[PDB]
Amino acid sequence: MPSIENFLAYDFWQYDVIRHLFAFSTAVFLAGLVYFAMTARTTAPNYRLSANISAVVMVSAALELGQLWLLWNESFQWAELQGSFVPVAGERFSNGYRYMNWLIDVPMLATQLVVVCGFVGTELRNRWAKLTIAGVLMILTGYVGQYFEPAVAGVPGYEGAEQFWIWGIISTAFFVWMLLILANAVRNPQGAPSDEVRSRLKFCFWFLLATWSIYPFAYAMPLFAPTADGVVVRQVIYTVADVSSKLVFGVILSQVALRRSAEEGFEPARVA
Ligand SMILES: CCCCCCCCCCCCO[C@@H]1O[C@H](CO)[C@@H](O[C@H]2O[C@H](CO)[C@@H](O)[C@H](O)[C@H]2O)[C@H](O)[C@H]1O
Ligand SMILES: CCCCCCCCCCCCO[C@@H]1O[C@H](CO)[C@@H](O[C@H]2O[C@H](CO)[C@@H](O)[C@H](O)[C@H]2O)[C@H](O)[C@H]1O
Ligand SMILES: *C\C=C(C)/C=C/C=C(C)/C=C/C1=C(C)CCCC1(C)C
């Protein structure tokens, strides 16, 4: 079933704000790719994997928000006689472009926190394995559940609303599992860090937990407000969540990684 954004007319400001957000997010991810590519060799080789993974994530999200911007521009046209941005015949906007590209974004964002946490070798591969399974089995189940928003909103002709509150509470259980795997990864760092680095890693985990909880709130948006205003607020708290959980988290984790590298022995990290 299509998105709830295809059953709502928009004002000029309502359409313009959403397309400005889609342009701004892909611009800031394209800039963050340049940033994480430039300042990648300033960290030690043992935490440079987390620096390369950040650039991989910036590749992944700029190739998601650009497609969302393209599909937002194609699926709607201006109707002058109503003063509205009505849809077009033939094209329908989809919010699954987010969920398809989160499958690379979420396990790498958790893995790069485990890397700065100091887990190497078999332990890194074993904590990546659990996190990838738990983040594939939650993102795909959210992707099934987000196909029932015309049903859960109340659009006539689109039934089957019971499958919206099932594949969200299913994806919640694996999200709790991911938070647990990251929690006992940040409670026991490896490599004997300092008491400031431990607080920074705990702050990294709590920041990830706070910026990842916005996504179940934006998921339930066509149950709270299935209106164009609700769609605008949903895209605002999607842009804020995207930037906070991928670029801001990357800059905070690179600061913790540089602190660890400059603490152990790295002169490029000490002079920076
Ligand atoms: C969108 C345009 C481009 C945006 C670019 C900017 C991205 C963000 C830059 C980094 C800013 C945040 O940087 C982060 O700040 C918090 C502020 O509480 C610091 O955190 C500090 O306070 C917290 C309070 O809970 C303590 O737990 C922590 O031990 C302490 O260091 C982090 O050590 C620092 O890494
Ligand atoms: C536009 C998308 C990309 C934006 C990224 C740029 C960050 C701009 C916001 C800066 C926030 C202030 O917080 C500050 O962050 C920078 C960058 O992490 C940290 O800077 C640290 O790493 C940089 C990069 O290797 C070094 O040049 C610097 O000497 C070092 O201290 C500071 O220790 C911290 O105090
Ligand atoms: C942009 C990268 C990030 C941080 C993506 C994260 C996505 C989630 C944490 C989503 C979680 C969901 C839950 C727990 C509820 C069901 C639907 C979602 C998939 C949105």
Side-chain angles (χ1 to χ4, degrees):
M1 285 168 13
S3 198
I4 202 77
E5 298 133 50
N6 298 294
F7 300 95
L8 296 163
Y10 294 94
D11 293 64
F12 181 79
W13 80 266
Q14 274 157 349
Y15 178 84
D16 208 43
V17 154
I18 297 171
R19 79 167 147 180
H20 288 356
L21 292 161
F22 289 159
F24 156 75
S25 310
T26 190
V28 73
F29 293 144
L30 258 181
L33 174 58
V34 180
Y35 180 70
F36 290 136
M38 277 176 131
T39 65
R41 270 65 200 121
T42 184
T43 88
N46 14 273
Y47 317 116
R48 205 176 266 136
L49 177 61
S50 161
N52 305 338
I53 276 174
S54 291
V56 159
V57 166
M58 299 309 118
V59 166
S60 161
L63 249 180
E64 148 197 3
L65 269 304
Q67 321 240 9
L68 288 159
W69 168 83
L70 226 39
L71 201 52
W72 190 251
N73 293 350
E74 301 260 335
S75 305
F76 304 92
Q77 67 146 22
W78 174 258
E80 189 73 64
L81 211 59
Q82 325 168 256
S84 213
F85 260 107
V86 303
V88 278
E91 194 61 277
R92 287 268 168 282
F93 185 77
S94 190
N95 228 293
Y97 266 136
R98 268 178 225 266
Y99 290 80
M100 262 310 87
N101 274 150
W102 289 346
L103 286 167
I104 161 175
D105 275 335
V106 155
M108 299 297 117
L109 275 168
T111 289
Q112 73 159 124
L113 181 57
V114 184
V115 165
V116 188
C117 276
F119 289 94
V120 296
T122 318
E123 293 159 354
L124 186 33
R125 202 259 319 200
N126 259 0
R127 286 151 181 76
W128 164 87
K130 275 147 226 164
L131 280 170
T132 300
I133 287 160
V136 151
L137 260 190
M138 86 147 194
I139 282 179
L140 277 205
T141 51
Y143 180 64
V144 183
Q146 64 101 43
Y147 271 132
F148 297 87
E149 33 173 88
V152 81
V155 166
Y158 287 87
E159 40 152 17
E162 190 219 9
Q163 304 297 314
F164 195 90
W165 76 60
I166 285 181
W167 303 87
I169 75 97
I170 283 171
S171 166
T172 287
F174 299 96
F175 186 43
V176 164
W177 187 17
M178 299 194 53
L179 295 186
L180 285 163
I181 299 155
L182 294 150
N184 322 60
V186 305
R187 295 177 47 276
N188 301 118
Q190 273 328 288
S194 174
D195 281 358
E196 197 242 8
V197 176
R198 302 189 167 249
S199 317
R200 283 172 153 247
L201 286 171
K202 290 178 176 318
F203 169 73
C204 281
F205 169 66
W206 283 119
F207 182 76
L208 175 152
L209 185 140
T211 66
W212 282 26
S213 291
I214 305 158
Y215 286 111
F217 248 87
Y219 173 79
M221 262 276 183
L223 189 48
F224 298 153
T227 322
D229 321 271
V231 166
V232 173
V233 185
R234 188 196 196 175
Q235 247 68 242
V236 160
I237 74 158
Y238 261 142
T239 297
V240 167
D242 276 314
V243 173
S244 210
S245 77
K246 226 162 305 195
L247 179 88
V248 185
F249 187 51
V251 183
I252 292 191
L253 253 191
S254 69
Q255 282 173 230
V256 190
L258 282 155
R259 167 73 167 133
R260 291 209 75 169
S261 302
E263 154 163 82
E264 292 169 346
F266 211 38
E267 180 92 59
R270 280 173 162 176
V271 299

mmCIF file of all heavy atoms in Angstrom, residues 220-235:
data_model
loop_
_atom_site.group_PDB
_atom_site.id
_atom_site.type_symbol
_atom_site.label_atom_id
_atom_site.label_comp_id
_atom_site.label_asym_id
_atom_site.label_seq_id
_atom_site.Cartn_x
_atom_site.Cartn_y
_atom_site.Cartn_z
ATOM 1 N N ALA A 220 5.012 6.061 14.194
ATOM 2 C CA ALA A 220 3.628 6.136 14.643
ATOM 3 C C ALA A 220 2.964 7.462 14.302
ATOM 4 O O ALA A 220 1.896 7.758 14.851
ATOM 5 C CB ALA A 220 3.553 5.892 16.152
ATOM 6 N N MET A 221 3.581 8.265 13.433
ATOM 7 C CA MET A 221 2.999 9.549 13.048
ATOM 8 C C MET A 221 1.656 9.451 12.317
ATOM 9 O O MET A 221 0.787 10.297 12.594
ATOM 10 C CB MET A 221 4.017 10.357 12.234
ATOM 11 C CG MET A 221 4.752 11.376 13.075
ATOM 12 S SD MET A 221 3.841 12.916 13.254
ATOM 13 C CE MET A 221 5.021 13.874 14.194
ATOM 14 N N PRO A 222 1.400 8.486 11.371
ATOM 15 C CA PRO A 222 0.029 8.382 10.843
ATOM 16 C C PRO A 222 -0.908 7.570 11.729
ATOM 17 O O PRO A 222 -1.710 6.773 11.233
ATOM 18 C CB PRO A 222 0.224 7.697 9.482
ATOM 19 C CG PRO A 222 1.682 7.786 9.195
ATOM 20 C CD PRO A 222 2.316 7.691 10.532
ATOM 21 N N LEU A 223 -0.817 7.775 13.040
ATOM 22 C CA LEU A 223 -1.816 7.342 14.004
ATOM 23 C C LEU A 223 -2.106 8.533 14.905
ATOM 24 O O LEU A 223 -3.213 8.684 15.432
ATOM 25 C CB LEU A 223 -1.329 6.134 14.805
ATOM 26 C CG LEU A 223 -2.350 5.442 15.711
ATOM 27 C CD1 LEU A 223 -3.651 5.177 14.968
ATOM 28 C CD2 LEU A 223 -1.779 4.149 16.271
ATOM 29 N N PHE A 224 -1.095 9.389 15.073
ATOM 30 C CA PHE A 224 -1.272 10.634 15.811
ATOM 31 C C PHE A 224 -1.908 11.697 14.926
ATOM 32 O O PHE A 224 -2.973 12.236 15.245
ATOM 33 C CB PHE A 224 0.073 11.128 16.355
ATOM 34 C CG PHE A 224 0.738 10.184 17.326
ATOM 35 C CD1 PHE A 224 2.120 10.187 17.465
ATOM 36 C CD2 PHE A 224 -0.006 9.299 18.095
ATOM 37 C CE1 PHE A 224 2.746 9.327 18.351
ATOM 38 C CE2 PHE A 224 0.614 8.435 18.983
ATOM 39 C CZ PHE A 224 1.991 8.449 19.110
ATOM 40 N N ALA A 225 -1.265 12.012 13.801
ATOM 41 C CA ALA A 225 -1.726 13.078 12.914
ATOM 42 C C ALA A 225 -1.528 12.671 11.461
ATOM 43 O O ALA A 225 -0.431 12.809 10.905
ATOM 44 C CB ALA A 225 -1.004 14.393 13.208
ATOM 45 N N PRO A 226 -2.588 12.155 10.801
ATOM 46 C CA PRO A 226 -2.543 11.869 9.361
ATOM 47 C C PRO A 226 -2.927 13.070 8.497
ATOM 48 O O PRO A 226 -3.775 12.976 7.608
ATOM 49 C CB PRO A 226 -3.543 10.720 9.217
ATOM 50 C CG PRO A 226 -4.556 10.983 10.285
ATOM 51 C CD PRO A 226 -3.859 11.720 11.407
ATOM 52 N N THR A 227 -2.294 14.209 8.762
ATOM 53 C CA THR A 227 -2.580 15.468 8.096
ATOM 54 C C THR A 227 -1.281 15.952 7.454
ATOM 55 O O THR A 227 -0.207 15.404 7.718
ATOM 56 C CB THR A 227 -3.136 16.491 9.108
ATOM 57 O OG1 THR A 227 -4.003 15.812 10.021
ATOM 58 C CG2 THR A 227 -3.983 17.565 8.425
ATOM 59 N N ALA A 228 -1.387 16.957 6.575
ATOM 60 C CA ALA A 228 -0.201 17.539 5.950
ATOM 61 C C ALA A 228 0.722 18.184 6.977
ATOM 62 O O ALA A 228 1.950 18.108 6.840
ATOM 63 C CB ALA A 228 -0.611 18.560 4.890
ATOM 64 N N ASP A 229 0.150 18.805 8.015
ATOM 65 C CA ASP A 229 0.956 19.314 9.121
ATOM 66 C C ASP A 229 1.683 18.187 9.846
ATOM 67 O O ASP A 229 2.862 18.328 10.194
ATOM 68 C CB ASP A 229 0.079 20.099 10.097
ATOM 69 C CG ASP A 229 -0.971 20.940 9.396
ATOM 70 O OD1 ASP A 229 -0.666 22.102 9.054
ATOM 71 O OD2 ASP A 229 -2.103 20.450 9.197
ATOM 72 N N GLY A 230 1.002 17.058 10.062
ATOM 73 C CA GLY A 230 1.654 15.911 10.674
ATOM 74 C C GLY A 230 2.771 15.347 9.817
ATOM 75 O O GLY A 230 3.801 14.914 10.334
ATOM 76 N N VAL A 231 2.592 15.377 8.493
ATOM 77 C CA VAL A 231 3.636 14.956 7.561
ATOM 78 C C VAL A 231 4.846 15.887 7.632
ATOM 79 O O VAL A 231 5.998 15.425 7.605
ATOM 80 C CB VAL A 231 3.045 14.873 6.137
ATOM 81 C CG1 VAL A 231 4.131 14.767 5.084
ATOM 82 C CG2 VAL A 231 2.093 13.697 6.027
ATOM 83 N N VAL A 232 4.609 17.201 7.736
ATOM 84 C CA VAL A 232 5.707 18.161 7.863
ATOM 85 C C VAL A 232 6.485 17.937 9.159
ATOM 86 O O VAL A 232 7.723 17.921 9.156
ATOM 87 C CB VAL A 232 5.178 19.605 7.760
ATOM 88 C CG1 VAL A 232 6.277 20.608 8.066
ATOM 89 C CG2 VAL A 232 4.648 19.866 6.372
ATOM 90 N N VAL A 233 5.777 17.736 10.276
ATOM 91 C CA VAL A 233 6.456 17.477 11.550
ATOM 92 C C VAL A 233 7.189 16.138 11.517
ATOM 93 O O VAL A 233 8.297 16.014 12.054
ATOM 94 C CB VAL A 233 5.460 17.554 12.725
ATOM 95 C CG1 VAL A 233 6.179 17.403 14.050
ATOM 96 C CG2 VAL A 233 4.751 18.890 12.721
ATOM 97 N N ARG A 234 6.609 15.135 10.861
ATOM 98 C CA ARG A 234 7.237 13.840 10.648
ATOM 99 C C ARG A 234 8.530 13.929 9.853
ATOM 100 O O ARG A 234 9.500 13.256 10.209
ATOM 101 C CB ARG A 234 6.249 12.911 9.937
ATOM 102 C CG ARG A 234 6.711 11.479 9.816
ATOM 103 C CD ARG A 234 5.906 10.714 8.780
ATOM 104 N NE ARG A 234 6.114 9.281 8.943
ATOM 105 C CZ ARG A 234 5.481 8.338 8.260
ATOM 106 N NH1 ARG A 234 4.561 8.636 7.358
ATOM 107 N NH2 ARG A 234 5.767 7.062 8.501
ATOM 108 N N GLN A 235 8.570 14.746 8.803
ATOM 109 C CA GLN A 235 9.797 14.955 8.053
ATOM 110 C C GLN A 235 10.807 15.825 8.788
ATOM 111 O O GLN A 235 12.012 15.619 8.615
ATOM 112 C CB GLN A 235 9.485 15.583 6.689
ATOM 113 C CG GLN A 235 9.779 14.654 5.517
ATOM 114 C CD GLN A 235 8.832 13.466 5.466
ATOM 115 O OE1 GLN A 235 9.253 12.314 5.572
ATOM 116 N NE2 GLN A 235 7.541 13.743 5.319
#
